[PDB]
Amino acid sequence: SEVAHRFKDLGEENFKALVLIAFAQYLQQCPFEDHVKLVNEVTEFAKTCVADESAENCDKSLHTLFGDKLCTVATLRETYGEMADCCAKQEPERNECFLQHKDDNPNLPRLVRPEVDVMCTAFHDNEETFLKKYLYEIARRHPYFYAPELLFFAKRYKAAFTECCQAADKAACLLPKLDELRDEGKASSAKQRLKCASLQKFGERAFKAWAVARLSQRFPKAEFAEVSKLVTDLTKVHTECCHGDLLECADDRADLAKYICENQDSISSKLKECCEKPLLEKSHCIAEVENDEMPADLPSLAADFVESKDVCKNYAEAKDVFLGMFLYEYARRHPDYSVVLLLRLAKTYETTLEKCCAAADPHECYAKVFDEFKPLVEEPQNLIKQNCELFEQLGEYKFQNALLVRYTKKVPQVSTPTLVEVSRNLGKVGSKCCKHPEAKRMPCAEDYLSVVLNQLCVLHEKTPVSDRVTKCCTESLVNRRPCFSALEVDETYVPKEFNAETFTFHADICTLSEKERQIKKQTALVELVKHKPKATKEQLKAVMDDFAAFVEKCCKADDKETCFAEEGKKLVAASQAA
Numbered sequence: 001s002e003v004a005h006r007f008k009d010l011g012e013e014n015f016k017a018l019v020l021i022a023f024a025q026y027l028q029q030c031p032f033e034d035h036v037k038l039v040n041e042v043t044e045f046a047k048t049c050v051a052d053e054s055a056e057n058c059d060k061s062l063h064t065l066f067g068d069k070l071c072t073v074a075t076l077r078e079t080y081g082e083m084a085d086c087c088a089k090q091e092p093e094r095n096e097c098f099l100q101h102k103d104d105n106p107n108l109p110r111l112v113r114p115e116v117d118v119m120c121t122a123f124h125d126n127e128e129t130f131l132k133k134y135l136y137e138i139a140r141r142h143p144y145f146y147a148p149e150l151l152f153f154a155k156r157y158k159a160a161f162t163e164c165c166q167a168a169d170k171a172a173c174l175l176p177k178l179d180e181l182r183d184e185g186k187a188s189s190a191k192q193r194l195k196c197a198s199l200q201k202f203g204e205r206a207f208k209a210w211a212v213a214r215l216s217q218r219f220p221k222a223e224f225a226e227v228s229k230l231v232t233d234l235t236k237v238h239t240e241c242c243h244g245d246l247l248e249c250a251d252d253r254a255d256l257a258k259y260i261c262e263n264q265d266s267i268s269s270k271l272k273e274c275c276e277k278p279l280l281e282k283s284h285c286i287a288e289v290e291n292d293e294m295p296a297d298l299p300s301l302a303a304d305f306v307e308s309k310d311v312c313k314n315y316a317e318a319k320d321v322f323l324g325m326f327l328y329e330y331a332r333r334h335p336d337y338s339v340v341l342l343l344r345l346a347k348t349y350e351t352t353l354e355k356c357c358a359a360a361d362p363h364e365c366y367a368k369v370f371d372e373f374k375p376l377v378e379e380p381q382n383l384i385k386q387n388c389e390l391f392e393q394l395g396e397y398k399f400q401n402a403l404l405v406r407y408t409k410k411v412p413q414v415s416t417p418t419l420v421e422v423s424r425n426l427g428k429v430g431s432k433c434c435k436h437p438e439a440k441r442m443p444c445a446e447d448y449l450s451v452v453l454n455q456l457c458v459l460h461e462k463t464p465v466s467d468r469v470t471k472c473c474t475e476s477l478v479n480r481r482p483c484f485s486a487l488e489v490d491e492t493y494v495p496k497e498f499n500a501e502t503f504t505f506h507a508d509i510c511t512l513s514e515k516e517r518q519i520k521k522q523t524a525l526v527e528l529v530k531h532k533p534k535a536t537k538e539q540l541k542a543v544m545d546d547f548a549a550f551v552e553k554c555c556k557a558d559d560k561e562t563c564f565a566e567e568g569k570k571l572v573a574a575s576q577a578a
């Protein structure tokens, strides 16, 4: 029995959590109650398998068990139409069907939260259903959320209420901690959505290189043969979590944590503090540990990779192992480089050996490779230096707007909502990285951008409208950022035509938070640029500056919100003039 295996290892608590998350991620539109029921029916069954390891179907794979369970509600096409088809399938892939049907942008209503007085009550009354509901909402809205981590976020979520409801000012104690979690959770999800994207669209060889480079940065002292071991295990963990095998992902992740703590002295010296605490905390800890100090006396890379005369020889023997060592050797001594720049250098190195080694005299050919690294390295450096300077003078809001105009002109076909979301995130790099020393700036900024950009790519892949996004997204994982930076302004785009409703005015905007107020303004700017791509430079103020004036004059007016229907007609008149 397998369900028995995972049960004994994870226990009742975690085993129940993970399955809920698994179910929540597959049927994101299915109600909380139903998931709970199935989860329990599924848990009960597990209990029997523990005792009798051959009872009913205890001999089955989680795939069949989980699959049939869900299919007891999926056949209801009137609710989950396209799902029923999945259930009519077999073993080899009644699952691939499910995996392929995860929605990255569910049509799930916004999740507003009740006053601090209700949450605390509902929490205290039933501490179990309260947390269960949390995971449900998160995992159903983030189908790729790294499960093992979600449990961690859960433990904290609980501790937030456990402490705050016992304060003097609950709203004061809670609200903050809750915001802090809402953010960190969205980040952790984006970060992980990339990892699954890598594996799924580029293959594991891609995810592996990324791991080697990142880990080598964190553990400089670690010897290649050790890193490789970590990368190999690490890969599987993530390979499982993305395919939807949550339980084994959680198991294997734990084992990896155990290992890394046992051989501490062989890996990093900053792992101590991590290995002295509760599993879940220990896992989240090592995963975000700072890089260890760089080994004192280290030889030069040119030695064994460009000057040696056996290069091509070794490259032919085990190219994969050779390049892996190159990356590892170049990354360990370069924690000031972004993971994607490292992977770019590596790719540039491999491409070179390929053409060079088949030459009349290799050494002479690949002798000046490091000369072609120089550009590759400086490009990001300048980009960062430039965009941080700007960010500094305009502030986040004004900076985001800039990027809004910019990207919209780059790929005008993209849907406004997406352009807005992406642009905003892209602007959050300023505050998140610009305040760092150049030594830590590049890895911070460019690797963050790889996350943001993938968001735009997955969202786009749903309904492809721009080949230019399709190209940059699909041609190279490591080159996406540079690929987008290279785009200027589409010369084939044909300006949209005005038709009121596209942007409706309902006075309802006077109640939304300050944030959703900016957002409505930005959504406007995008719509503007789509209607007047060319005519625009910084004359892109003549309307927004006035766009501001507009809003300021109808929420404060005593009129019944009519000005909104009338006035809105006056600014449109002035706008067109410019």
Ligand SMILES: CCCCC1C(=O)N(c2ccccc2)N(c2ccc(O)cc2)C1=O
Binding pocket: 146, 188, 191, 192, 210, 211, 214, 215, 234, 253, 256, 257, 260, 282, 283, 284, 286, 287, 288
């Ligand atoms: C103590 C055992 C933890 C195993 C682990 C690890 O090393 N990284 C990890 C680190 C670098 C590259 C790839 C994976 N991730 C991880 C995943 C998502 C995330 O946002 C943070 C970290 C892991 O889950």
